[PDB]
Design a binder for this molecule. Structure first.
Ligand SMILES: [Zn+2]
Length: 258
């Protein structure tokens, strides 16, 4: 039937409806820090999130997305390995059933408790739907979460999850500042990849930050209470909604730092 993360519809089954699942620029991947090439021609990232406008939070049945108004150049990413302006459309998370897993990307095979993805679309393509059809259509910022101290700027998100427990539910979610979710340093790794969920289009330029942010146990605990199912259905907790590392194949991971 339709894809998810269970035994019967899990990532190992995805190729059957999305042949691109077995492609050349599949995501995520394991980041080998010894093999990653420091590229000194890489420019510093540019994050301008001061005019960000969140609108809504939604449970789509695979994660929760916080959506932004992308009608104009309000929250954009540029620089780094990018040419042009990329507009933030949404952000979402991937997390585990336990603290030892949940991240999609891995560092020297190390898994984090969760991974945040900030989704941006290349403005030269005019809409998100046209952007995903392009090799350089999207820029996704990947941020690792480790369990430690609470992240203050994540609390507003945590607190609204009770209201979007099941699939299809959504809530009003304005005045959220995405700046609260950034690590102090913007050192990153970059490589060419794809969407980590179906349709798995090979249209992304991943930007993975070296520095993880800490969240508390209690913060991640709230994630784990969400449901994959819609209301009035047998409860299936929303956990382990992460795709395993894929073959790097013919790709090189570049580093912005030594
Ligand atoms: Zn994602």
């Amino acid at each position: 039937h339709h894809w998810g993360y269970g035994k019967h519809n899990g990532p190992e089954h995805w190729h059957k409806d999305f042949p691109i699942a077995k492609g050349e620029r599949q995501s995520p991947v394991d980041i080998d820090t010894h093999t990653a090439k420091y590229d000194p021609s890489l420019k510093p990232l540019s994050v301008s999130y001061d005019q960000a406008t969140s609108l809504r939070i939604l449970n789509n049945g695979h994660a929760f997305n916080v959506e932004f108004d992308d009608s104009q150049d309000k929250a954009v990413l540029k620089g780094g390995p990018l040419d042009g302006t990329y507009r933030l459309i949404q952000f979402h998370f991937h997390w585990g059933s336990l603290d030892g897993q949940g991240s999609e990307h891995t560092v020297d095979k190390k898994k984090y408790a969760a991974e945040l993805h900030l989704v941006h679309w290349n403005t030269k393509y005019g809409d998100f739907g046209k952007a995903v059809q392009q090799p350089d259509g999207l820029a996704v910022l990947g941020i690792f979460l480790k369990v430690g101290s609470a992240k203050p700027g994540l609390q507003k998100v945590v607190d609204v999850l009770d209201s979007i427990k099941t699939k299809g539910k959504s809530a009003d979610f304005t005045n959220f500042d995405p700046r609260g979710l950034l690590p102090e340093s913007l050192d990153y790794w970059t490589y060419p990849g794809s969407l980590a969920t179906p349709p798995l289009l090979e249209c992304v330029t991943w930007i993975v930050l070296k520095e993880p942010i800490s969240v508390s146990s209690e913060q991640v605990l709230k994630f784990r209470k969400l449901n994959f199912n819609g209301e009035g259905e047998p409860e299936e907790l929303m956990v382990d909604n992460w795709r395993p590392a894929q073959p790097l194949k013919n790709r090189q991971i570049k580093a912005s730092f030594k």
